[PDB]
Amino acid sequence: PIATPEVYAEMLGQAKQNSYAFPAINCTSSETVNAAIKGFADAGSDGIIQFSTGGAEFGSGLGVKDMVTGAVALAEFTHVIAAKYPVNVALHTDHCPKDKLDSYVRPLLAISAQRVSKGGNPLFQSHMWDGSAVPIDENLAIAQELLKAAAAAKIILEIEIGVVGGYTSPEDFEKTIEALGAGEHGKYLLAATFGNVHGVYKPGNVKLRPDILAQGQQVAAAKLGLPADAKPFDFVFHGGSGSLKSEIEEALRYGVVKMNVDTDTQYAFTRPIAGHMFTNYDGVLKVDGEVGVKKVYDPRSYLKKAEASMSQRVVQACNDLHCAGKSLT
Amino acid sequence: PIATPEVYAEMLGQAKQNSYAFPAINCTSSETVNAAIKGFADAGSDGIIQFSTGGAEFGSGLGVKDMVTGAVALAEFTHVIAAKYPVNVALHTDHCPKDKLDSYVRPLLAISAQRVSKGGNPLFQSHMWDGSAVPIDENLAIAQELLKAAAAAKIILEIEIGVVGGYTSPEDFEKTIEALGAGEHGKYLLAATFGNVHGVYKPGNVKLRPDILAQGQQVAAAKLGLPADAKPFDFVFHGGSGSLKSEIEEALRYGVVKMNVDTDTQYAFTRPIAGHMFTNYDGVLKVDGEVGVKKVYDPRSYLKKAEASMSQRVVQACNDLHCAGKSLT
Ligand SMILES: O=C(COP(=O)(O)O)N(O)CCCCOP(=O)(O)O
Ligand SMILES: O=C(COP(=O)(O)O)N(O)CCCCOP(=O)(O)O
Ligand code: NA
Ligand code: NA
Ligand code: NA
Ligand code: NA
Ligand SMILES: [Zn+2]
Ligand SMILES: [Zn+2]
């Protein structure tokens, strides 16, 4: 089923306590949502589906190109499908910068607040506010207003300090903790940047420093007069694709509960489609006067292959993040 | 918007009065539903989107493989999307033989009946019962029970007499009127077999006798005491793809209000994907130790081309059926 806010909070709480994390898989369509959930279910794991602004716009179709519509349509699809699986699936929206808040996060928050006031659950269980392109103080100020709105909709806010490419400071950690607290003001996830980069590159290109995360927890713990080993932040690891298994295990140790994967699942989806087209070249194309072969230009023939391949990569992520076999069900 | 039962009846009513017909486009996913509606909108036309048993199963994902779930999920997606377009889009389910009635049409009828009993609209505006593989008497006995159930849910039932390849008799037309009436017991669409075949083949292979439909109308009019130019039947034309201009135009004069298109839109969807993979072979594949090119293995890059190409084929079908520019809006 779709994770209720209570289940989602327990998912993240148990992951934090036990040092594992959930893959958050970017999805653009019915096929990729199906692939991601089957992946979670196959791994016996709960999981996160997320829609970027570009992904939501894509999902709304070329005739609409409206993020809210695409997000809502894909969410409504997902609510029906997820009901048929025993694992818990949370819906999340991915980076929303300042100039998109009004056209994406804020109206989605409103939709959920309306559902909640009627005694139901929010459509999405978390939304990301990405303010990494403005100064930390502006970012946190916007975060504080968004947190009030999110809390009323029973939604968890994710925020970003520092930049993801295509290294957060100790003082930034303190400001954040001073502004947002440890979650009394409502639960939030923190994407702090330790060298992470969107996309997949020749390995060794991207230099991760998970120790930045360790230091952030210590500084926050000290500010809050908590245990030295306390972990006041729930971290998010952006740019998960192409990461080393040892990088991942270290980040898990420091309180990463969510790791975003997009590029590697994109490659997994597309790879068997390219393969289908090449091996079936003379059935997918009408060649030498022939009319082609319906069985192979039927989109389901190759999209089922893409789906299965993407699921298998999701199962791999569940094992990399140690959430495999951990579904709260 | 999604067509309400009343505007669907009006769409079909005006199509019949004016000798035009709607494309009924088979869709399996968010991308194809988006392509189909964008096509209708581009043509200034209302339209029908349909889910086969296979399409619905695909839509539910490999981890579910359940027809009702698939149909319902795609339908909920489509309800959100269609609301953003001025044109009317009716949702239909295709081809359900006897052994699948209990797992597809009947359960879906109940879902819609529940929505209607609470004062809402049905989730689908029509469902097809395909009894072409049973004797006509058994066909019509099952149809009578379904039609009562369909009408109660404000849903149009489509039935098939005779057979779609992969030519209806005079008395079958009379039996059909005998069993189901002319719409007083609930509206239904009639797929009568005049030589239709599913799929696209070499020209001259499929030989249609559209005059069978003229004879069906004239014969039913006589048995009903109506004027000779009455058209008691609303006909559906199966095997639309790769059909000739002059047969379609002839069929439109005889009361065809719905033409199914599947194979041609599948080819249109796939063709640019194939092209993308070939021209981009060394970006969609990780070749010679390179990591590929994310901008071309991102599924959106080729799926947007697929969707646009499908929408253009849908626009063509609207032009061929003369419903282009006719949207009730
Ligand atoms: O951190 C990640 C994923 O990183 P990865 O792609 O390295 O796995 N994400 O936040 C996903 C990136 C989304 C980018 O937006 P578009 O839809 O316009 O491409
Ligand atoms: O009449 C038509 C279309 O005819 P066409 O394919 O010649 O355009 N249709 O009824 C659509 C074809 C049904 C598809 O069956 P599955 O997906 O369950 O395998
Ligand atoms: Na995110
Ligand atoms: Na967001
Ligand atoms: Na990455
Ligand atoms: Na055909
Ligand atoms: Zn990111
Ligand atoms: Zn058909």
Coordinates of N, CA, C and O in Angstrom, one line a residue, chain B residues 144-293:
Chain B
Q144 N -27.8 -9.7 -23.1 CA -29.0 -9.2 -22.5 C -28.7 -8.9 -21.0 O -29.1 -7.9 -20.5
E145 N -28.0 -9.8 -20.3 CA -27.8 -9.7 -18.9 C -26.7 -8.6 -18.7 O -26.9 -7.8 -17.7
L146 N -25.7 -8.6 -19.5 CA -24.7 -7.5 -19.4 C -25.3 -6.1 -19.7 O -24.9 -5.2 -19.0
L147 N -26.2 -6.0 -20.6 CA -26.8 -4.7 -21.0 C -27.6 -4.1 -19.9 O -27.5 -2.9 -19.7
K148 N -28.4 -4.9 -19.2 CA -29.1 -4.5 -18.0 C -28.1 -4.0 -16.9 O -28.3 -2.9 -16.3
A149 N -27.0 -4.7 -16.7 CA -26.0 -4.3 -15.8 C -25.2 -3.0 -16.3 O -25.0 -2.1 -15.5
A150 N -25.0 -3.0 -17.6 CA -24.3 -1.8 -18.1 C -25.2 -0.5 -18.0 O -24.7 0.5 -17.5
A151 N -26.4 -0.6 -18.5 CA -27.3 0.5 -18.5 C -27.5 1.0 -17.0 O -27.6 2.2 -16.8
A152 N -27.5 0.1 -16.1 CA -27.7 0.5 -14.7 C -26.5 1.4 -14.2 O -26.7 2.3 -13.3
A153 N -25.4 1.1 -14.8 CA -24.2 1.9 -14.4 C -23.9 3.1 -15.4 O -22.9 3.7 -15.3
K154 N -24.9 3.4 -16.3 CA -24.8 4.5 -17.2 C -23.7 4.2 -18.2 O -22.9 5.1 -18.6
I155 N -23.5 2.9 -18.6 CA -22.4 2.5 -19.4 C -22.9 1.9 -20.7 O -23.9 1.1 -20.7
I156 N -22.3 2.3 -21.8 CA -22.7 1.7 -23.1 C -22.0 0.4 -23.3 O -20.8 0.3 -23.2
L157 N -22.8 -0.6 -23.7 CA -22.2 -1.9 -23.9 C -21.9 -2.1 -25.4 O -22.7 -1.7 -26.3
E158 N -20.7 -2.5 -25.8 CA -20.4 -2.9 -27.2 C -20.4 -4.4 -27.3 O -19.9 -5.1 -26.5
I159 N -21.1 -4.9 -28.3 CA -21.1 -6.4 -28.5 C -20.6 -6.7 -30.0 O -20.5 -5.8 -30.8
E160 N -20.3 -8.0 -30.2 CA -19.8 -8.3 -31.5 C -20.5 -9.6 -32.0 O -20.6 -10.6 -31.3
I161 N -21.0 -9.5 -33.2 CA -21.7 -10.6 -33.8 C -20.9 -10.9 -35.1 O -20.6 -10.1 -35.9
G162 N -20.6 -12.2 -35.3 CA -19.7 -12.6 -36.3 C -18.3 -12.5 -35.8 O -18.1 -12.6 -34.6
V163 N -17.3 -12.3 -36.7 CA -15.9 -12.6 -36.3 C -14.9 -11.6 -36.9 O -14.9 -11.3 -38.1
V164 N -13.9 -11.1 -36.0 CA -12.8 -10.3 -36.5 C -11.6 -11.2 -36.7 O -11.1 -11.9 -35.8
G165 N -11.1 -11.2 -38.0 CA -10.0 -12.0 -38.3 C -8.7 -11.5 -37.8 O -8.7 -10.4 -37.2
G166 N -7.6 -12.2 -37.9 CA -6.3 -11.8 -37.4 C -5.2 -12.3 -38.3 O -5.3 -12.4 -39.5
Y167 N -18.4 -12.9 -42.7 CA -19.2 -11.7 -42.9 C -20.6 -11.9 -42.4 O -21.3 -12.7 -42.8
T168 N -21.0 -11.0 -41.5 CA -22.2 -11.1 -40.7 C -23.5 -11.4 -41.5 O -23.7 -10.8 -42.6
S169 N -24.3 -12.2 -41.0 CA -25.6 -12.6 -41.6 C -26.7 -11.6 -41.4 O -26.7 -10.9 -40.5
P170 N -27.7 -11.7 -42.3 CA -29.0 -11.0 -42.3 C -29.9 -11.3 -41.1 O -30.5 -10.4 -40.5
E171 N -29.9 -12.5 -40.7 CA -30.8 -12.9 -39.6 C -30.2 -12.6 -38.3 O -30.9 -12.5 -37.3
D172 N -28.8 -12.6 -38.2 CA -28.1 -12.2 -37.0 C -28.5 -10.8 -36.6 O -28.7 -10.5 -35.5
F173 N -28.6 -9.9 -37.6 CA -29.0 -8.5 -37.4 C -30.4 -8.6 -36.8 O -30.7 -7.8 -35.8
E174 N -31.3 -9.4 -37.3 CA -32.7 -9.5 -36.8 C -32.7 -10.1 -35.3 O -33.4 -9.6 -34.5
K175 N -31.9 -11.2 -35.1 CA -31.8 -11.7 -33.8 C -31.3 -10.7 -32.8 O -31.7 -10.7 -31.6
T176 N -30.4 -9.8 -33.2 CA -29.8 -8.9 -32.3 C -30.8 -7.9 -31.9 O -31.0 -7.6 -30.7
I177 N -31.6 -7.4 -32.8 CA -32.7 -6.4 -32.5 C -33.8 -7.1 -31.6 O -34.3 -6.5 -30.7
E178 N -34.0 -8.4 -31.9 CA -35.0 -9.2 -31.1 C -34.6 -9.3 -29.7 O -35.4 -9.1 -28.8
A179 N -33.3 -9.6 -29.5 CA -32.8 -9.8 -28.1 C -32.5 -8.5 -27.3 O -32.8 -8.5 -26.1
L180 N -31.9 -7.5 -28.0 CA -31.5 -6.3 -27.3 C -32.3 -5.1 -27.5 O -32.1 -4.1 -26.9
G181 N -33.3 -5.1 -28.5 CA -33.9 -3.9 -28.9 C -33.0 -2.9 -29.6 O -31.9 -3.3 -30.1
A182 N -33.5 -1.7 -29.8 CA -32.8 -0.6 -30.5 C -32.2 0.4 -29.6 O -32.0 1.6 -30.0
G183 N -32.0 0.1 -28.3 CA -31.5 1.1 -27.4 C -32.5 1.5 -26.2 O -32.1 2.0 -25.3
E184 N -33.8 1.1 -26.4 CA -34.7 1.3 -25.3 C -34.4 0.5 -24.0 O -34.7 1.0 -22.9
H185 N -33.7 -0.6 -24.2 CA -33.3 -1.4 -23.0 C -31.9 -1.1 -22.6 O -31.3 -1.8 -21.8
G186 N -31.4 0.0 -23.1 CA -30.0 0.5 -22.9 C -29.3 0.5 -24.2 O -29.5 -0.3 -25.1
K187 N -28.4 1.5 -24.3 CA -27.7 1.8 -25.6 C -26.6 0.8 -25.7 O -26.0 0.4 -24.7
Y188 N -26.4 0.3 -26.9 CA -25.3 -0.6 -27.2 C -24.7 -0.3 -28.6 O -25.4 0.2 -29.5
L189 N -23.4 -0.6 -28.8 CA -22.7 -0.5 -30.0 C -22.6 -1.9 -30.6 O -22.4 -2.8 -29.9
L190 N -22.7 -2.0 -31.9 CA -22.7 -3.3 -32.6 C -21.5 -3.4 -33.5 O -21.3 -2.7 -34.4
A191 N -20.6 -4.4 -33.1 CA -19.6 -4.7 -34.1 C -20.1 -5.9 -34.9 O -20.1 -7.0 -34.4
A192 N -20.4 -5.6 -36.1 CA -20.9 -6.6 -37.0 C -19.7 -6.9 -37.9 O -18.9 -5.9 -38.2
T193 N -19.5 -8.1 -38.4 CA -18.4 -8.5 -39.2 C -18.7 -8.4 -40.7 O -19.5 -9.2 -41.2
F194 N -18.1 -7.4 -41.3 CA -18.1 -7.3 -42.8 C -16.8 -7.6 -43.5 O -16.6 -7.3 -44.7
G195 N -15.9 -8.3 -42.9 CA -14.5 -8.6 -43.4 C -13.3 -8.0 -42.7 O -12.2 -8.1 -43.2
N196 N -13.6 -7.4 -41.6 CA -12.5 -6.8 -40.7 C -11.4 -7.8 -40.3 O -11.8 -9.0 -40.0
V197 N -10.2 -7.4 -40.2 CA -9.1 -8.2 -39.6 C -8.1 -7.3 -38.8 O -7.7 -6.3 -39.3
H198 N -7.7 -7.8 -37.6 CA -6.8 -7.0 -36.8 C -5.3 -7.1 -37.3 O -4.9 -8.1 -37.8
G199 N -4.6 -6.0 -37.2 CA -3.2 -5.9 -37.7 C -3.1 -5.3 -39.0 O -4.1 -5.0 -39.7
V200 N -1.8 -5.0 -39.5 CA -1.6 -4.4 -40.8 C -0.9 -5.3 -41.7 O 0.1 -5.9 -41.3
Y201 N -1.4 -5.5 -42.9 CA -0.9 -6.5 -43.9 C -0.7 -5.8 -45.2 O -0.9 -4.6 -45.4
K202 N -0.2 -6.6 -46.2 CA 0.0 -6.1 -47.5 C -1.3 -5.8 -48.2 O -2.3 -6.5 -48.0
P203 N -1.3 -4.6 -48.9 CA -2.6 -4.2 -49.5 C -3.3 -5.1 -50.4 O -2.7 -5.7 -51.3
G204 N -4.6 -5.3 -50.2 CA -5.4 -6.2 -51.0 C -5.7 -7.5 -50.3 O -6.5 -8.3 -50.9
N205 N -5.2 -7.7 -49.2 CA -5.3 -8.9 -48.4 C -6.6 -9.0 -47.7 O -7.2 -10.1 -47.6
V206 N -7.1 -7.9 -47.1 CA -8.4 -7.7 -46.4 C -9.4 -7.2 -47.3 O -9.3 -6.1 -47.9
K207 N -10.5 -7.9 -47.5 CA -11.6 -7.5 -48.4 C -12.9 -7.2 -47.7 O -13.6 -8.2 -47.3
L208 N -13.3 -6.0 -47.5 CA -14.4 -5.6 -46.8 C -15.7 -5.5 -47.7 O -15.6 -5.1 -48.8
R209 N -16.8 -5.8 -47.1 CA -18.1 -5.6 -47.7 C -19.0 -4.7 -46.8 O -19.8 -5.2 -46.1
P210 N -18.7 -3.4 -46.8 CA -19.4 -2.4 -46.0 C -20.9 -2.4 -46.2 O -21.6 -2.0 -45.3
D211 N -21.3 -2.9 -47.4 CA -22.8 -2.9 -47.7 C -23.6 -3.8 -46.8 O -24.8 -3.7 -46.7
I212 N -22.9 -4.8 -46.2 CA -23.5 -5.6 -45.2 C -24.1 -4.7 -44.1 O -25.2 -5.0 -43.5
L213 N -23.5 -3.6 -43.8 CA -23.9 -2.7 -42.7 C -25.2 -2.0 -43.2 O -26.1 -1.8 -42.4
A214 N -25.2 -1.6 -44.4 CA -26.4 -0.9 -45.0 C -27.6 -1.8 -44.9 O -28.7 -1.4 -44.6
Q215 N -27.3 -3.1 -45.2 CA -28.4 -4.1 -45.2 C -28.9 -4.4 -43.8 O -30.0 -4.6 -43.6
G216 N -27.9 -4.4 -42.8 CA -28.3 -4.5 -41.4 C -29.2 -3.4 -40.9 O -30.2 -3.7 -40.3
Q217 N -28.9 -2.2 -41.3 CA -29.7 -1.0 -40.9 C -31.1 -1.1 -41.6 O -32.1 -0.9 -40.9
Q218 N -31.1 -1.4 -42.8 CA -32.4 -1.4 -43.6 C -33.3 -2.5 -43.1 O -34.5 -2.3 -42.9
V219 N -32.8 -3.6 -42.8 CA -33.5 -4.8 -42.3 C -34.0 -4.6 -40.9 O -35.2 -5.0 -40.6
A220 N -33.2 -4.0 -40.0 CA -33.7 -3.7 -38.6 C -34.8 -2.6 -38.7 O -35.7 -2.7 -37.9
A221 N -34.6 -1.6 -39.5 CA -35.6 -0.5 -39.7 C -36.9 -1.1 -40.0 O -38.0 -0.8 -39.5
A222 N -36.9 -2.1 -41.0 CA -38.2 -2.7 -41.4 C -38.8 -3.5 -40.3 O -40.0 -3.4 -40.1
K223 N -38.0 -4.3 -39.6 CA -38.6 -5.1 -38.5 C -39.1 -4.2 -37.4 O -40.0 -4.6 -36.7
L224 N -38.6 -3.0 -37.3 CA -39.0 -2.1 -36.2 C -40.1 -1.1 -36.7 O -40.6 -0.3 -35.8
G225 N -40.5 -1.2 -37.9 CA -41.5 -0.3 -38.4 C -41.1 1.2 -38.6 O -41.9 2.1 -38.6
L226 N -39.8 1.4 -38.7 CA -39.2 2.7 -39.0 C -39.0 3.0 -40.4 O -39.1 2.1 -41.3
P227 N -38.9 4.3 -40.8 CA -38.6 4.7 -42.1 C -37.3 4.0 -42.7 O -36.5 3.6 -41.8
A228 N -37.2 3.8 -44.0 CA -36.2 3.0 -44.6 C -34.8 3.6 -44.4 O -33.8 2.8 -44.4
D229 N -34.7 4.9 -44.1 CA -33.4 5.5 -43.9 C -33.0 5.6 -42.4 O -32.1 6.3 -42.1
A230 N -33.8 5.0 -41.6 CA -33.5 5.0 -40.1 C -32.2 4.2 -40.0 O -31.9 3.2 -40.7
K231 N -31.4 4.5 -38.9 CA -30.2 3.7 -38.6 C -30.3 3.3 -37.1 O -29.8 4.0 -36.2
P232 N -31.1 2.2 -36.8 CA -31.3 1.7 -35.5 C -30.0 1.3 -34.8 O -29.9 1.3 -33.6
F233 N -29.0 0.9 -35.6 CA -27.7 0.4 -35.1 C -26.6 1.5 -35.1 O -26.5 2.3 -36.0
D234 N -25.8 1.5 -34.0 CA -24.5 2.2 -34.0 C -23.4 1.2 -34.1 O -23.1 0.4 -33.3
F235 N -22.7 1.3 -35.3 CA -21.7 0.3 -35.6 C -20.3 0.6 -35.2 O -19.9 1.8 -35.1
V236 N -19.5 -0.4 -34.8 CA -18.1 -0.3 -34.6 C -17.3 -1.0 -35.6 O -17.6 -2.2 -36.0
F237 N -16.2 -0.4 -36.1 CA -15.4 -0.9 -37.1 C -14.1 -1.4 -36.5 O -13.2 -0.7 -36.2
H238 N -14.0 -2.8 -36.4 CA -12.7 -3.4 -35.9 C -11.7 -3.5 -37.0 O -12.1 -3.7 -38.1
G239 N -10.4 -3.6 -36.6 CA -9.4 -3.6 -37.6 C -9.3 -2.4 -38.4 O -9.4 -2.4 -39.7
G240 N -9.1 -1.2 -37.8 CA -9.1 0.1 -38.4 C -7.8 0.3 -39.1 O -7.7 0.8 -40.3
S241 N -6.7 0.0 -38.5 CA -5.3 0.3 -39.0 C -5.1 -0.3 -40.4 O -5.6 -1.4 -40.7
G242 N -4.4 0.4 -41.2 CA -4.2 0.0 -42.6 C -5.5 -0.3 -43.3 O -5.7 -1.3 -44.0
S243 N -6.5 0.6 -43.2 CA -7.8 0.5 -43.9 C -7.8 1.6 -45.0 O -7.2 2.6 -44.8
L244 N -8.5 1.3 -46.1 CA -8.5 2.3 -47.2 C -9.5 3.4 -47.0 O -10.6 3.3 -46.4
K245 N -9.2 4.6 -47.6 CA -10.0 5.8 -47.5 C -11.5 5.5 -47.9 O -12.4 6.0 -47.3
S246 N -11.7 4.8 -49.0 CA -13.0 4.7 -49.7 C -13.9 3.7 -49.0 O -15.1 3.7 -49.2
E247 N -13.3 2.8 -48.2 CA -14.1 1.8 -47.4 C -14.6 2.4 -46.1 O -15.7 2.3 -45.7
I248 N -13.7 3.2 -45.5 CA -14.0 3.9 -44.3 C -15.1 4.9 -44.6 O -16.1 5.0 -43.8
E249 N -15.0 5.7 -45.7 CA -16.0 6.7 -46.0 C -17.3 6.0 -46.3 O -18.4 6.5 -45.9
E250 N -17.3 4.8 -47.0 CA -18.5 4.0 -47.2 C -19.1 3.6 -45.9 O -20.3 3.8 -45.6
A251 N -18.3 3.0 -45.0 CA -18.7 2.6 -43.7 C -19.3 3.7 -42.8 O -20.3 3.5 -42.1
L252 N -18.8 4.9 -43.0 CA -19.3 6.1 -42.2 C -20.7 6.4 -42.6 O -21.5 6.9 -41.8
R253 N -21.0 6.2 -43.9 CA -22.4 6.5 -44.4 C -23.4 5.5 -43.8 O -24.6 5.8 -43.7
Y254 N -22.9 4.3 -43.4 CA -23.9 3.3 -42.9 C -24.0 3.2 -41.4 O -24.7 2.3 -40.9
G255 N -23.5 4.2 -40.7 CA -23.7 4.3 -39.2 C -22.5 3.8 -38.4 O -22.7 3.6 -37.2
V256 N -21.3 3.7 -39.0 CA -20.1 3.4 -38.1 C -19.8 4.7 -37.3 O -19.5 5.7 -37.9
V257 N -19.9 4.6 -36.0 CA -19.5 5.7 -35.1 C -18.2 5.6 -34.4 O -17.8 6.5 -33.7
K258 N -17.6 4.4 -34.5 CA -16.4 4.1 -33.7 C -15.5 3.2 -34.6 O -15.9 2.2 -35.1
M259 N -14.2 3.6 -34.7 CA -13.3 2.8 -35.4 C -12.1 2.5 -34.6 O -11.4 3.4 -34.1
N260 N -11.8 1.2 -34.3 CA -10.7 0.8 -33.5 C -9.3 0.9 -34.2 O -9.2 0.5 -35.3
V261 N -8.4 1.6 -33.6 CA -7.0 1.7 -34.2 C -6.1 1.3 -33.1 O -6.1 1.8 -32.0
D262 N -5.3 0.3 -33.5 CA -4.2 -0.2 -32.6 C -2.9 -0.4 -33.3 O -1.9 0.3 -32.9
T263 N -2.8 -1.2 -34.3 CA -1.5 -1.6 -34.9 C -0.8 -0.4 -35.5 O 0.4 -0.3 -35.3
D264 N -1.5 0.5 -36.2 CA -0.9 1.7 -36.8 C -0.3 2.7 -35.7 O 0.8 3.2 -35.9
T265 N -1.0 2.8 -34.6 CA -0.5 3.7 -33.6 C 0.7 3.1 -32.8 O 1.6 3.8 -32.3
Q266 N 0.7 1.8 -32.7 CA 1.9 1.1 -32.1 C 3.1 1.3 -33.0 O 4.2 1.5 -32.5
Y267 N 2.9 1.2 -34.3 CA 4.0 1.3 -35.2 C 4.5 2.8 -35.1 O 5.8 3.0 -35.0
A268 N 3.6 3.7 -35.1 CA 3.9 5.1 -35.0 C 4.7 5.4 -33.7 O 5.6 6.2 -33.7
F269 N 4.3 4.8 -32.6 CA 5.0 4.9 -31.3 C 6.4 4.4 -31.3 O 7.4 5.1 -30.9
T270 N 6.5 3.2 -31.8 CA 7.8 2.5 -31.8 C 8.8 3.0 -32.8 O 10.0 3.1 -32.5
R271 N 8.4 3.5 -34.0 CA 9.2 3.8 -35.0 C 10.4 4.8 -34.7 O 11.5 4.6 -35.0
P272 N 10.0 5.9 -34.0 CA 11.1 6.9 -33.5 C 12.0 6.3 -32.4 O 13.1 6.8 -32.3
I273 N 11.5 5.4 -31.6 CA 12.3 4.8 -30.6 C 13.4 4.0 -31.3 O 14.6 4.1 -31.0
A274 N 13.0 3.2 -32.2 CA 14.0 2.4 -33.0 C 15.0 3.4 -33.6 O 16.2 3.1 -33.5
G275 N 14.5 4.4 -34.3 CA 15.4 5.4 -34.9 C 16.4 6.0 -33.9 O 17.6 6.1 -34.1
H276 N 15.9 6.4 -32.7 CA 16.7 6.9 -31.6 C 17.8 6.0 -31.2 O 19.0 6.4 -31.1
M277 N 17.5 4.7 -31.1 CA 18.5 3.7 -30.6 C 19.6 3.5 -31.6 O 20.7 3.4 -31.3
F278 N 19.2 3.4 -32.9 CA 20.2 3.3 -34.0 C 21.1 4.5 -34.1 O 22.3 4.4 -34.0
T279 N 20.5 5.7 -34.2 CA 21.4 6.9 -34.4 C 22.2 7.2 -33.2 O 23.3 7.7 -33.3
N280 N 21.7 6.9 -32.0 CA 22.4 7.1 -30.7 C 23.1 5.8 -30.1 O 23.2 5.7 -28.9
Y281 N 23.3 4.8 -31.0 CA 23.8 3.5 -30.5 C 24.9 3.6 -29.4 O 24.9 2.8 -28.5
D282 N 25.8 4.5 -29.6 CA 27.0 4.6 -28.7 C 26.7 5.5 -27.5 O 27.6 5.8 -26.7
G283 N 25.5 6.1 -27.5 CA 25.1 6.8 -26.2 C 24.2 6.1 -25.4 O 24.3 6.1 -24.1
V284 N 23.3 5.2 -26.0 CA 22.4 4.4 -25.2 C 23.1 3.1 -24.7 O 22.6 2.5 -23.8
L285 N 24.2 2.8 -25.4 CA 25.0 1.7 -24.9 C 26.3 2.2 -24.3 O 26.8 3.2 -24.8
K286 N 26.8 1.5 -23.3 CA 28.1 1.9 -22.8 C 29.1 1.0 -23.6 O 29.2 -0.2 -23.5
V287 N 29.8 1.8 -24.5 CA 30.6 1.1 -25.6 C 32.1 1.5 -25.4 O 32.4 2.6 -25.1
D288 N 32.9 0.5 -25.7 CA 34.4 0.7 -25.8 C 34.9 1.3 -24.5 O 35.7 2.2 -24.6
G289 N 34.3 0.9 -23.3 CA 34.7 1.4 -22.0 C 34.2 2.8 -21.7 O 34.6 3.4 -20.6
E290 N 33.4 3.5 -22.6 CA 32.7 4.7 -22.2 C 31.5 4.5 -21.4 O 30.9 3.4 -21.4
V291 N 31.0 5.5 -20.7 CA 29.8 5.3 -19.8 C 28.4 5.7 -20.5 O 27.4 5.8 -19.8
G292 N 28.4 5.9 -21.8 CA 27.2 6.2 -22.5 C 26.9 7.7 -22.3 O 27.7 8.4 -21.8
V293 N 25.7 8.1 -22.8 CA 25.3 9.5 -22.8 C 23.9 9.6 -22.1 O 22.9 9.2 -22.7

